[PDB]
Design a binder for this molecule. Structure first.
Ligand SMILES: Oc1ccc(C(=C2CCC(CF)CC2)c2ccc(O)cc2)cc1
Ligand SMILES: Oc1ccc(C(=C2CCC(CF)CC2)c2ccc(O)cc2)cc1
Lengths: 11, 231, 238, 9
């Protein structure tokens, strides 16, 4: 739901 | 958490290694409300991507849940952008170094409503950092403190914050300061963090005003970061 | 100035003696509450507290050494911060509740407006003071720091700035001195000093968000803001 | 200004 969720992932 | 097992030098170098790069703006001196906020928005949006990757390399941050990471970043993103700004602007008295190809003075903040007040606050903070001879090792400690403390209202973050405090003291003792000079300098640095918070909240109002006007296109990321403060 | 000549214990005694009293609200349990009337309670309370704060500030070592314009500026900038840290201090012994007045205990439920987020932040700060076991001597030092630091950033006037800086250093030494007497190690002293000063960042935040909330209702034509309270609020615009 | 006056008295 948030872009910040996706970007903080990308391990 | 590996952050607690780190030595002071390991903590410092980890923060140094996590440091985002100084980015450039596009290539005319801004005066209008559109072009000024247009260049700043584009720069900040690109800086945000680096900040996120920087945050994940800050010791102890990754150990938090994703939702906590989101909360802390939403709370502190403008604070982090601003302390980076005043740091870059240290060697340029009376000017704000948003980018090496984008030096702004207070005269350009005049032509935008409610801008020059924040400009002067940023300039005063930068001047204070210069008079204190703020070191890069100290700066990265302060920026990490902002990230972890600004939304912190937990036991883990508490110990990490204490760890960074020990790291700051380590740096001052390493620089040859006495115990008296250490706790005095520590206090002075942390009191500035209160002013950084104030400027962020004022800047957030300014951005919210720009968004409401709807002339300068905001990125979807910047929107979410901004709307997170909408309450 | 006599402020720079004071010892740590003398600084503490001065601040403790300068402490304002705890005022009562006109809250009545038998009287029906409303969203506007509740804000009216807090408004009337804060307005009466301001007069005591102003006289409190005059007894803060180094404050009256400043020009009148600088004294006005600092109080204009910090009045809500000082009110809030006082509120947070009074609410320590009451988990999940805010003690605005001895006859006015409010929880997160008994709410409004947008204010509920601010309420939670105040509660969290109070919970922080509680777990830190904040002492009264530490509290009066913190409140004095807020007064002098919150507003500070031709020709000179610069002279006013470094005078504040020296007094701030004195309160810093006072804090360290207090912690040293408490039996804390050097590591624990620096850590606690840091913990205490980082809370000031939160108090600043709650003040800014609170100022937005107060400015929000002022446009809603809802609550009788006093003449002085209108001045203090208008100084933060925008 | 009220604050200015109260600081005097
Ligand atoms: O490196 C930085 C630091 C701060 C800013 C901004 C600031 C700092 C100066 C403020 C007062 F004018 C406005 C917000 C900013 C952020 C997001 C935007 O969409 C637009 C601007 C940009 C890059
Ligand atoms: O002792 C205190 C501390 C804070 C407040 C206020 C608060 C604290 C709680 C906030 C959350 F809603 C609102 C601001 C306040 C101030 C002025 C007003 O006109 C109205 C209220 C009053 C007395």
């Amino acid at each position: 739901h948030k872009i910040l969720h996706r970007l903080l992932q990308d391990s | 958490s590996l952050a607690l097992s780190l030595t002071a030098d390991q903590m410092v170098s980890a923060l140094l290694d996590a440091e985002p790069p100084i980015l450039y703006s596009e290539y005319t001196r801004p005066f209008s409300e559109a072009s000024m906020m247009g260049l700043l928005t584009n720069l900040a949006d690109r800086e945000l991507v680096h900040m996120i990757n920087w945050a994940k390399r800050v010791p102890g941050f990754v150990d938090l849940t994703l939702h906590d990471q989101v909360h802390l970043l939403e709370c502190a993103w403008l604070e982090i952008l601003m302390i980076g700004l005043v740091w870059r602007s240290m060697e340029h008295p009376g000017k704000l170094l948003f980018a090496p190809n984008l030096l702004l003075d207070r005269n350009q903040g005049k032509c935008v409503e409610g801008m020059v007040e924040i400009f002067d606050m940023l300039l005063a903070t930068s001047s204070r950092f210069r008079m204190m001879n703020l070191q890069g090792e100290e700066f990265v400690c302060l920026k990490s403190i902002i990230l972890l403390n600004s939304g912190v209202y937990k036991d883990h973050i508490h110990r990490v914050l204490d760890k960074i405090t020990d790291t700051l003291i380590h740096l001052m003792a390493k620089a040859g300061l006495t115990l008296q000079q250490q706790h005095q300098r520590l206090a002075q640095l942390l009191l500035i963090l209160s002013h950084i918070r104030h400027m962020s909240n004022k800047g957030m109002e300014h951005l919210y005003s720009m968004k409401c006007k709807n002339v300068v296109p905001l990125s979807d990321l910047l929107l979410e970061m901004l709307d997170a403060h909408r309450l």
